[PDB]
Here is the input.
Amino acid sequence: MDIDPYKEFGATVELLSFLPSDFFPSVRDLLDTASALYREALESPEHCSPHHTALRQAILCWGELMTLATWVGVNLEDPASRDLVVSYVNTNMGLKFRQLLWFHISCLTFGRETVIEYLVSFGVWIRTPPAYRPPNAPILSTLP
Amino acid sequence: MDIDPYKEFGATVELLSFLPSDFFPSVRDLLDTASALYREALESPEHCSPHHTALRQAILCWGELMTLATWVGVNLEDPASRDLVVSYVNTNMGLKFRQLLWFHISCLTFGRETVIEYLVSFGVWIRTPPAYRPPNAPILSTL
Amino acid sequence: MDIDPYKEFGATVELLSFLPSDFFPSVRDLLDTASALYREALESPEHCSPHHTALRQAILCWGELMTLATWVGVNLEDPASRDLVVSYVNTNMGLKFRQLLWFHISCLTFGRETVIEYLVSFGVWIRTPPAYRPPNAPILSTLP
Amino acid sequence: MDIDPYKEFGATVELLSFLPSDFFPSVRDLLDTASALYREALESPEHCSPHHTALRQAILCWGELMTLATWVGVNLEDPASRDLVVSYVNTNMGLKFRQLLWFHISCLTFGRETVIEYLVSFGVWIRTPPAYRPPNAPILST
Amino acid sequence: MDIDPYKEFGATVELLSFLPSDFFPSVRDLLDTASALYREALESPEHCSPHHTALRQAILCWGELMTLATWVGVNLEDPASRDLVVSYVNTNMGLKFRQLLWFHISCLTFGRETVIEYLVSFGVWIRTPPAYRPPNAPILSTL
Amino acid sequence: MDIDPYKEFGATVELLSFLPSDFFPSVRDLLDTASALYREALESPEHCSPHHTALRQAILCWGELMTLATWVGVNLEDPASRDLVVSYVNTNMGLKFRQLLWFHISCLTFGRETVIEYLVSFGVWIRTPPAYRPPNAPILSTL
Amino acid sequence: MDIDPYKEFGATVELLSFLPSDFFPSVRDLLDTASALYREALESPEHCSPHHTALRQAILCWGELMTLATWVGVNLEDPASRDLVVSYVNTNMGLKFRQLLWFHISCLTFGRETVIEYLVSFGVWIRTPPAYRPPNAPILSTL
Amino acid sequence: MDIDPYKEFGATVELLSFLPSDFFPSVRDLLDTASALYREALESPEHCSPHHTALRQAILCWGELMTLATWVGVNLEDPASRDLVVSYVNTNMGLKFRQLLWFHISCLTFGRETVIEYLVSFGVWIRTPPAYRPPNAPILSTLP
Amino acid sequence: MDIDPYKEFGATVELLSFLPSDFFPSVRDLLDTASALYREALESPEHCSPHHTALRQAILCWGELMTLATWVGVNLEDPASRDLVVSYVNTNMGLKFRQLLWFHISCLTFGRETVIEYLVSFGVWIRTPPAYRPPNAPILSTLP
Amino acid sequence: MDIDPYKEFGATVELLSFLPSDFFPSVRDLLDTASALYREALESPEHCSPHHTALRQAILCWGELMTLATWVGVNLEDPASRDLVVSYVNTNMGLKFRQLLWFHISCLTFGRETVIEYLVSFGVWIRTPPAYRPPNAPILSTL
Amino acid sequence: MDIDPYKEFGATVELLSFLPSDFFPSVRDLLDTASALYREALESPEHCSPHHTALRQAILCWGELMTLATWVGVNLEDPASRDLVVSYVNTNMGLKFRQLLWFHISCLTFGRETVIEYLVSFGVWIRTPPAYRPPNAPILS
Amino acid sequence: MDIDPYKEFGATVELLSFLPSDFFPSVRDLLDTASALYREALESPEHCSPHHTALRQAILCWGELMTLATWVGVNLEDPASRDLVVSYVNTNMGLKFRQLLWFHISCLTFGRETVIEYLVSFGVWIRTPPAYRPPNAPILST
Here is the structure.
């Protein structure tokens, strides 16, 4: 129905496309990052924030895919289809969840405006030719 | 972790399981109902309510599930595998998404308290023996 | 180019699609009701309401279509072609006029908000599985 | 030339045309209903209301119709022709008189606005296809 | 039961019986006069007068009788029965309609009291023996 | 039911018939003018004016007629029958729509009184002999 | 002397004839109801009500009729004449006394303004075709 | 069950039994007496008096008895039964109606207390031995 | 001594005869209802009500009758006489106790005036012919 | 299920059992006393006192017992069976009814406290040895 | 000795004995209704109300009954004795538990007074002979 | 629904598990103690206490098991299965009822807090090795 996941938060798919595909961390590291920082808030019966509301659904609909992978592992005695299904899952659908989890965790940790301006800064950094590219890339931190 | 989709809204998975599994409408037409009534709100760049965010996420991830089903049906070669994968997907991952869509659309249309009361009322009505239950099943209406 | 007959009033084609195709009455009954209830309204030189101009235009368009049907039935040499033309006319082009006449007549009789609420309620009713839907269906009436 | 009986009363011919032929009671029932409900008013000399003037003429004309029917039956020699004449005079022209008597009696008993709105609601109900209409028809009683 | 056609108009059946049966004009002439004088008032959607209210019903019932006659003449195949039925219809059933139409049209045109007095004045003239009966019968006129 | 399209706007069919049948422009040109001048108001969810509703209905009806013509040309098998049907359509059911579109578009562009007076002025100018009239026909302009 | 029973109470013979002839209860049941409900009032030396007076007179004359029937049954010899006399008595003179007793007892029990309206209501309900009337027949109740 | 027609008015059967059986006038004479004096009052829609109500009921039930007599005279095969039924009727059941009509008519005409006093006086007159009985019996009159 | 059980309360035997014999429930059900609703008031040393006073005596003399039945069962070696005795007891002496218990229990539960009105209404209901009798009979209840 | 006849009146079964069984009078004498002293109050439609209700109920159910005795004496065929039934009746069901009737009649005649004290006085007098007691037994008197 | 289960609640055993055996829903249905409507109150360490303690005790003892049933079924060797034992367990001890659960749940849902009057009305209805009783039963909802 | 029998009373199933399974007295002695001390309060129609409320239900649902055992022993014709069934009943289903009865009777008699402290003191006594365990086990007394 032409729904943009980040439009209600202020970004677009094109804006989030400034970062390369290899930039985003793994699903596992993001999940431990979430569970070590907002486990008591993603498990409480309150409308803490739309970021929390989106993170809950993202985690659940990723767990659905993990359960599907377990089911196709336990059934479908054809090894070729076994390998193809799981490979397609954790390669062509893990990227979207990585982007969503990274956005919703970085926003909650640092600031929506901070993340929004970091995206522009990183796009500017990555657009320049490598010869004139400065050695250090922009990074999100709260220390000097 | 351990997250309940309806706990932040006021319900639980067990409370939605009170109703029979063959009562909820089709996911094929629930999206049509949502698109014919809330498209302007769902495309808007604004937080309208906590219901809208969950509706958007559910619609998007179901669309991705349909994309996965299409990819399987296009790229796989074993008819048996193309049968089990699709059947599992749009039975097991379809029932709970039907429940989610019904809950959120009903909460947006009639009201959270009304839906919560209707759930309990229908659950109690169904279990009453037919010779004593009121003849007409409960229904949600706006008129 | 992208104009529908219901956006200016409050409804839409998809919203009006909640009712099944065969729900609407025939054309003769709708015309009889329109005449017997609002002839004086649709004879005066006044814009009583936007619901009246659309009714006038729809009635005139249906009259033109009926004149076309009479002409093709009278002045053609191929009975088969005559039959296909008339059948297509009163099978396909009559449904849209049925929907338009029903919408405008019901609005003028009961209220635009009442019609919208009835549409939503009937969509909810028809969406229910038959094993659980109540026997009686929603209807528009003023009696108790 | 196209005089209709209900325009002055606020209804129209096609508005009352939606009711089924079996919705109206018999003439022999509608006449006794009037005779038992409003008789002192129908015999009194004052114009009680415009609903009484339209009723007296209809009653007298139906009496004329019965007189014609019995005259035909008594003084026709062709049995088949007598059968068709009596059947026509008791079936085709009975429906209009039943409609008139029902309309006037129901108006006098229930008010005019109530009868008109009941007619509108009944038309709405009857135009609905049976697959979607509610099982029972709208009612008008006290 | 025993309803007087002329009682709400200050008259009675036997009072109107003073005039001979040949005095009343024909249905065609009476209907032409009505349609030429009060057509726009008879077709009005308002209660102009009880006279109009009665005239409308009388005209409609005469139309029904004409439809009956046409149906008999067309459908009925026996010429003798056809002729007998039509002769009876527009010989006997038309006289009362002629009286009613004449009464209501005259009361609409000249006046109820004028017609009431005219009936008595005509009775006086018709009772007189021919030797002393004036050769000019009473007439209705507006001068 | 004997309804006149222009009667609520202030004109009649006979008033628009005053001008010659060849004066009005083509349906394609009128639709292009409408699309290039009032699309943002014709596609708006508001009652801008009574002219806009009639314009919308006329455009939709013409689209339906064009769809009917396309269906006839696609499905009919007799070239002669296709010729008669299509030519009838865009020769006789087209002139009335040209008049309607011209009237409504000119009204929206210039004002109802200006368009109403222009009809009479142009007709009277055409009726007079050439030797006793201004040499150039009247024109509607905004400058 | 052309006297009506119910004309001093507010009804007529024709109005009571509106109801079916097989609706009124039996004479025995009516007498038992009267004896068990109003014996003290009927056996009192005071004008309790015109209903009481009429009830007393009707009961006394019905007792006289029963005494006549017993005398006929005792003294007559041929069975046929006794049969017709008795059957005529407790059919024809029984129906009207049933109507009288029902009217007076129902009045004394419920109210004249209620019994009068019940007659009209029941008659109109019975005349109505079954498919367009309430399914339950009207009944007089005290609770 | 044990109801008499005179207790509500002030008399009893025994008190009315002071007069001999052959004293009361005929049913016909009583009926013309009623019709010539209270015809307009016996047809009014008003409760003029309990006397009026009782007279109405008595007249109507005597009419029922007369109709029964006509029916038995018109439809019965046996002369013996035909004669016996009417002979019993207008001899045994007519006396009670004679007494009732006389009582009510005399009351309405003269006064209930006057009628009671007349009954009391006539008892004394009739019980006196014939030798000492005065020549003239008491009579109801309004003139001297 | 010509004593009526219900005269002191307001009803009469003929008035209580409106209900048929089959209407009243059994004796066991009435005793269970009494012992479940008013046991602590029937076993108390206070004049709570004349209804209680009558109920106590009725229950006691019914218990006496039951003791008589047990005694005649134990003795009276003749099975025929035993059978006639018990049959007479619990067929003809039980109906009166059923009526008494029903009357007193229904009065104590609902109200004396309500019971009287119900009796009158049920008499009216049962009097009418079956063809016109409404399908539902009057009943005593405190719920709609 | 455990109700005492005299508990509401202030006595017990064991208190009435204090007196000898042969002291109480006969049912016939007690009924004659009741009929000759309180018939006009026992026939009244009013609650005179709680004693009257108990007297009415006791008299009624004793009359029913006598009716049962008559029925068994009439219908039974074995003289021995009739003997046992009737003797059991008017001895065992008779003694307690004599006690009840005596208690209620004496109460109504003399006052509740007098009858209550008389029982104890008479019992203690009887249990006392003759040589150390008043020579004559106590008696209830109204003089 | 004689402890009436409902005496402390304003009710009485023969009062609840008039209801037919088909009036009460299944044990599974009643337990599901309880676990889906009052679970938060039934899991808390508070007392809440005297209507909760009896519900907890009944649920626990019924769980014991289920454990006994599955035990007998597993560790009984005679194929015939198990039939009678299990049928008795889920038929004769089922009715009393259904009565208790229905009483407590209906009280907690509708108020004690309403349920108390409904029992009297239903007893009056059920004691009427069929030839005179109304066609449909009195209703609590 | 995973309902703790002792949660509204400030206890826990694990906490009451400190006592050995042989510590609790027998059902007959516990019922005799209850009937000799709180009979007129358990048979009262009032909510004396939640302890009384629970004790009533415990007694009733034990009486149901006694009736079940009697029915089994009087109806089941197999003498091999009769033993097994009754032995299972009053060897396994009696222990939990004994624990419940002991807990509620002790809490009614001595006090909830006193019983709670006694449960901890008994555990402290029972954990001690035999060499240093005192020969006098803790007891409840007033």
Observations:
- Chain A has one domain: 1-144.
- Chain A has six helices and no strands.
- The domain at 1-144 of chain A is CATH 1.10.4090.10 (Hepatitis B viral capsid (hbcag) fold).
- The longest helix of chain A spans residues 50-74.
